[PDB]
Structures are given as structure tokens and as C-alpha cells.
Design a protein around this nucleic acid. Sequence first.
DNA 1: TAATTGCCCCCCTTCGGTGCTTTGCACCGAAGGGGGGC
Lengths: 392, 552
Amino acid sequence: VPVKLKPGMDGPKVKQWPLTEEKIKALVEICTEMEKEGKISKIGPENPYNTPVFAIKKKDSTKWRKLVDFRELNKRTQDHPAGLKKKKSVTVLDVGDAYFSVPLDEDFRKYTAFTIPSINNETPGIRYQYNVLPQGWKGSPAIFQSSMTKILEPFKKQNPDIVIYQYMDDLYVGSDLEIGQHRTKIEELRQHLLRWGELHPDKWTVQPIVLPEKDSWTVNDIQKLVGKLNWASQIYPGIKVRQLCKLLRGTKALTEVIPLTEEAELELAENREILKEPVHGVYYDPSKDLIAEIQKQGQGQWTYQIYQEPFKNLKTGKYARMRGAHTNDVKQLTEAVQKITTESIVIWGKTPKFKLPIQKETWETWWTEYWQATWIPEWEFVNTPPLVKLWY
Amino acid sequence: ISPIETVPVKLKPGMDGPKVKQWPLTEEKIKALVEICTEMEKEGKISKIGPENPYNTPVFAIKKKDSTKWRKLVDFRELNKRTQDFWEVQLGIPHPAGLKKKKSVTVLDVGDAYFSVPLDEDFRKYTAFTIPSINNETPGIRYQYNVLPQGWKGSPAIFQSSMTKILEPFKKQNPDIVIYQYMDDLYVGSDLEIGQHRTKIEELRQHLLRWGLTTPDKKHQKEPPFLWMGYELHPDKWTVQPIVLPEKDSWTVNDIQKLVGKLNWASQIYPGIKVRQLSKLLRGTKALTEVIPLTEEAELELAENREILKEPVHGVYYDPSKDLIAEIQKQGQGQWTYQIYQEPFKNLKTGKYARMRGAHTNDVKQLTEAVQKITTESIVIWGKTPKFKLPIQKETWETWWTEYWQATWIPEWEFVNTPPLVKLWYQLEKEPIVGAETFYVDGAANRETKLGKAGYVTNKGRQKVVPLTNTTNQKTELQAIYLALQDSGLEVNIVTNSQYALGIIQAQPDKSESELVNQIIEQLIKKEKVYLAWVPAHKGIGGNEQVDKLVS
DNA sequence: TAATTGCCCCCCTTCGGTGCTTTGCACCGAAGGGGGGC
Ligand SMILES: Nc1ncnc2c1ncn2[C@H]1C[C@H](O)[C@@H](COP(=O)(O)OP(=O)(O)OP(=O)(O)O)O1
Ligand SMILES: [Mg+2]
Ligand SMILES: [Mg+2]
């Protein structure tokens, strides 16, 4: 398939970040094996393009996997079942290896260049380019789509109740059957793929905005409640404060107990009822991009909002490791990013643009040590503290 | 020249070769260029050309590290602008601290490194140059490069790739030989006996000669100490080659820049090097020849750095069977030193961190940044992250990273009780303080007259409004919080309508680039209990709207 | 005004771009200077 870049695009020119010794050794072994079978070929410096590369150790798997960050190439390259989210059990299968069977267009190979670094810069970095369809590039599924449909046709017709979606390197196959029956179907699908050459989206609850409940309210409590309601006014038009604001009249001590008036109590009940109901008027536009904001709430708790336009959320959730020791904040944030990306792929078929609540240097230093997925969402870093925790 | 395959190079689309005239050259330079060009023409490294070639590029000569020998350079800036882009394969600089101890060591250099690698034929016409005749009259001799020219932006990457290709078979046949290659410089370490190591060295030299890469005996070092990449390598230790700090009575901007650069270079093995006071002298200066007097803070720093540099220090070689340990120490004014070692008092490496990232920071954030810098440098050099020894209590770090809104982490670390400890100087109360006085502070400023006002209306009737000149709205809000802190007791509750001031203060800074924030920090440290509360500004919340007209 | 070059890593300062709500302020990357290497 003669792939092309987007009109007016140049090509990826991203520098390689340093890697640990074990990662470099694994990459050297993997790339030697790949070059032996012609999947990659050594290139020189006259190729001006580059994408970063690293290695990951997948979930409870002792085998290293080479991962290429094709985000710039994916953005520069010119190339969804609505019932999958409603399924009962979704299993994600890695079908990336198949991509190594179909060659890649010659004129495009130069865009897949990458550089393996060296420990202590003992030697200049070793450059390779892909001869076959690489894992992580968005054009690889778009080129292997025909073969994927050909392979899956004997399965989908035999199992019409199983919904199969493909994103990049991952097959999300979902069913409404029993977990044992689901595992049996997964084994059948494996065998079918070999011969032909554990999500639970039903439990994806939203995180609503809850006002606090108290038998005695102070001036500070009413002030915080009024601020929270003022913030929610942008999300739920028709929310009101007025009487609560009238309660905060004059200068009073923050610890003074102020009784709730009848109008204030009635309006608070109305406000709670409005917050209970979901926001109405949000529709997923496939043209616009997804934005996922993450907030750290402490005690191993994180909250997130996936939205396409500000103050109009398409999904609100709360990732929680519930401490359990696990003092690593970067590991928790990486796991949250991976889970949110998987949810976004299942629900909308698109990875979201992440607004990570972390310093850039810490993320680039440590994120590869905990990454388990074969895809990398685009992310930016927010350097502004949230005013008041309003999703907790 | 060499049987090396050329790297195909092309011009940028739509561009043509340079036509830059040769500038006049001195007679010494002309004679050196004539001799070099005659020798190169005899060996086929350059070829005579005539009217068929319309391109030209100025040439000149400089002195090499070894004097009495000239390096011929070409000002290929136009051709470099019109040359295709390359990807550089040199990703960094090897460090002696990353070297393992080897029984036998040899440092090799290849003679005329670039001139031994052929240049792409179709590109050769673009490398045309004219050697001017002595004095004048007779026209200069026009040549073109048949090999990699020095001064062309494609030469380094091409040479490095070619050298890697040349060294691949020998390294495959000799997996027990360690070869560090930087351009044409080859460090070769082995655990063999000296006789077997020299036999292997002769085999490597023959292998290089088969590719047209001569290794002259002048640049072939066989005995320690080895001069490698600016370092002196001994069998069990390494040092930097001697660093000569300039001794000037009157310092210009360029002299201060050179001194700071040399001190930064020296800080990799000399502990305690500080350059902050000297770097502050470079702020606001315009001309590189402007004389900057020392400010009696740069003088003390210079004296301390000189005293540090007086005593000779050395690093040790990496032992992969032991553990990497990085100790961090604070020095004040946002400066940190660190030592990476495997055994106590045997430093593999030393360094400093003094970056001032952000307008407002505290010691914990700077320590985290220093840890990140050390981690990435250690990953570069040794391929692994070290175990940290930090002057911060486990409780302090726990409180900071659990109460902070950003994700922060420090790898496996242990507290070390070194007197200048890292701590948070104040804590904001999570709940309002009973019995304490409550201030409703407010600040406004018109964005036309650059004037405003600020006040702290109190629940007990106290109030005060101050006018402010040349201040913005944010400055007025910060000044209102400062007012609240000034006229309060040891315990105070503060309510403001400024999320900017809240964002600044909740980060718990101890130093800032703004004097107002510094005064606020001083007042916060003075207090015992402080609770900061935000409130929507124009929504009738009493106090912050009861009398914000006072300041509006 | 001189001396005129190229690539790589680092630090320190300056300036323009971007973002976000608060058109001021904070942050970041590129480019200038310097050091080191070849
Ligand atoms: N100042 C410089 N400008 C441009 N290229 C340089 C410079 N210094 C070194 N190089 C490049 C070109 C050289 O061929 C290559 C190897 O460096 P070096 O050993 O100093 O010289 P060389 O190989 O030309 O000569 P020799 O070793 O015979 O003195 O690095
Ligand atoms: Mg040489
Ligand atoms: Mg050399």
C-alpha cells in the first residue's frame, strides 16, 4: 500500500531519550533478531528522520517487547462499534506480530527510522528502519485491515454475539457470555488466528458531583459550598446559589455556626437533585479530539474527566489504587493514564489528549518503567494547581 | 583513499551550489594551504578543476592541538544551508566514570580521519574551492574535495557511521575487547596480558589499515596516563586534564562567561564548585567587552572555587558488581552538590544543580529536580539509577508528596543527617482556626491608570485600605494577603478572591523572584497557624463583597 | 569589526511564543554566550 504523508508535512525528527542498561540490551537482542529476518534494516545518517524507541515488559511476561513512539508519524500520516461499550466482558489481544508479515511501502520506510543508543555513549547510536509494517504506526492497521477482515470472517459469522474492534495493535473482543465461556471463546479465537495466519465495561460508573451533607454548617462550609456551586454553574446551567449567598452576608468568623434558612435548605435540596441527574446536551463529535484531565486527590486517589469542549464532560471517573502501600505516584499516574486510554478506545475508538498533573521531566524520566501498553497517547503537562477539589 | 562505500548526499530541493568568493589570506596561511593541498592532490584526496565548475567556497586554516601542523577548514555555511538534513548518530559524550577497570588499555587515533572517507561523487562539484596565489597576480588553483571536508555539516555523521561500519567486524570477532569510539578516537580496553593486548592492538591496526584508515604511531598511546577525551586515565583512577582558571584583575563579560564555563567543566569531579554569584554578573550586560566589577559575592565564590581546585582530585572506575550511591547536599540560594560513588569517599562522579526553574519554588521541588537530573545522567553513564542519600526527612517528603497536587516521586532513597536539612518552612491549615481572627482581603487595580488598592476587612470591625501605584490586579491581591499577614496575630484565617495568590501560596514556596512573595513567605514563617480560603469574588459572599468597594 | 568551519553533550541568560483567565503572569523551548570533545 503506497502510503503518503499529510499534505505539507515533513516527517518525524524526534530525538532518542536515554535508556537503562537492561532496556538497551533487550533492544539490541530484539533488533538483531529482527534484522536477521529482514523486518528492519540498518540505515545511515543521510536519513534525516527519527522516532524514539524503548522496551517494555508486559503484564507478568518475562519477554521484552520493543516499542516505537510513532506519535509524530501518526499525526503526520495521511491514511466504531457503539455496542462494544455495552458488552459484558472485553478481552484485549495483541495482534501486532501479524503486521510483521506484510511489507511496507519503500518510499515510506525512511519515515520509520529509529536509533538505538549506547551505554555511556560507547559507540554512535545504531540506526534502523522498518522494512515491514511497524507496530505502533496508525497506518499498519489501515493497511492490514483487509487481511484482518479475511481472517476474522470465519469467526464473526460463527460467533455473531461477539463484537470485535481493532485499534492499532489491539483487538478488543467483547461478549455477553459467562467468564468461563468468554475464556473458551478467547482460546478459540487464538487458535483460529494461529491457524489462519479482561475488561468489564458494564461496571464503568460515572463520578457525579456530590454536595456535602452536614447537621451543622459553618460560614466556611457555606462559603466552600457556594464556591463549588459557582464552579458547577458552568457545567449544569440552572444551578442556583442566591439564598446560600445571602447567608454569607456581612463579615463573620469562619467557625461561626450559621443555621440554614428554609429557602436555603430548599434551594440546597434542589441543587442536589440537579447535580444527581446527568448533564444533558453533550454529544461525542468524531471530528474533534478528546481531552482527558487528571487530578490527584491524595491517598492513592485520582479523578479524571474526558471531554471534547470545556465544561461539557463526556465521562467523569475516579481511578483509585486505595493506597495499599504503593508510594509511587508516577506508577499510579501511568496506570491511570493506561486505564483511561483503554476506556476511551473502547467507548469512542480514539485515544485522548492527556493533561498530566506532573512535571514534564519526572514523566519523561520514569513513565517508560511502568508502561504496559503498545500505544502512546499524546499528552501535555499542566502547571496550574486546581483551585478547589471539586470532583471529590 | 578507502574502499568505504560513499553515503549518497543531495542538495535541498531547488537549491544550487555556493558561489562565495575567497577572502584574502595571510602568506603563512597561504603557504600552509598550498602544502596541504599539494599533498592531498598527490594522494587523490582533492582534484584539480577548471572552468567547468562554477562553484566556490572560502577556505582557511587553523592550528591543531599539536602545533606546527595545520587543519584546513572550508566555510561551507552557504552549502550547509543548502545541504539536505542529516540525523546525528552521536548521542552524547563518553565519561570515564562509566569505564570499567581493565588490565590493559590503549588509545588510538587515526590520521587524517575525514580525508580517509570518500565523498559522494555527485556532491563533489559543490565542494569547489580556490587556493589564492601568494601575494597576487597569478590566479589561485581551483580544487574540489574527493573526501569528507572539514566544515561541512554532513561530514561528522558520515564519518561516525563509516567508522562504526569499519569496526563492526573486529568487534564481532573480539567480543571481550571494549572499544569506545568517539569520531576517530579509539579507547581499547581488555583484561588480556600486555603482550596479548598488544597483539590484539596490532590486529586492530591492520584491520583499520585494510580500510585505508592509517593509525600513526605519534598518536598511539601505549602507557598510562592516557589522554582520552580531556581526561587523564590511570590504571585505578581518572582525573580531568589540568584546568587553568583565568587570573584577571579587571573582568569583562566574556571573561566571566569563560570562567563560568570552566568552573562548570571542573564541577564534574571537583566537589563544591559554585557559580551562582559569578553567573549573576552576566544578567543585564550588553557588550562582551564591558568590564564587570566583582560584587564581593562573586569574589568569595571565586576564592572558594580556587581553593577547591587547588587540591588534585580523581574519580574511580565503575564496578558493575557493586551499588551506585548518589549523595545530595544543599548549599543555599538554590544550589546543590552531589557525589556519585560506590564505596565511601571514592567518588565516581561529582556534580552540581543550580537551575532556577519557576518564579516561586521551595527546597523540596529543587531537590526533586536535582534528583531527576542525577537520575537521567546516571542512566546515560551507567545505564542504571543510583540509590539516593538525601538531606530530607522521610516524614517531610511524605507530607509533601501526599499533600501536593502534582505527581512527585523520588527513587529508592535513604535519609542522611547532614546539618543543612531540607524542610518545609510553613504549613497551611486544612481547617479554619477557631478563636483566631478572620480577614476578608481584597485587591483591585485599573488596567489603564496602573493604580489600585487593597484591604483586609476583619470580622471584628478592623479594616484598612492601602493605595498601590504601578501595580496590577495580581500584585494588589498579593499585597492584600500581605496586609492580612502583617496586622494579624500568631493565628489567622484569611479569605481572598484570588486564585492566583492561592496558587502561589499553597505551593509553599520559600524563595521567589518577587519581593512581595518573599515578604509574604517571611510573614507566613513567622505565624504559627494560617488557614487560606478562596471565595468567588462578585457573588455576594459577605466580607469579600461587604467591603471590596473599600478597594474598588 | 573582525575573524570567518562542522557535529555532539553540558550550564546560564534572554526573548519570543503559548496558555489561561486574571491581557498579566507563568512556563518552556530556542538561540546567544561559554566550557568540554573530535
Ligand atoms: N576544529 C575542527 N573543525 C572541524 N572538524 C574537526 C575539527 N576538529 C576535528 N574535526 C574533525 C575532522 C577530523 O578529521 C576529525 C578527527 O579529528 P583530529 O584527530 O583532530 O584530526 P585529523 O584526523 O584530521 O588529523 P590528525 O589526527 O592526523 O592530526 O574530526
Ligand atoms: Mg585523527
Ligand atoms: Mg582524535
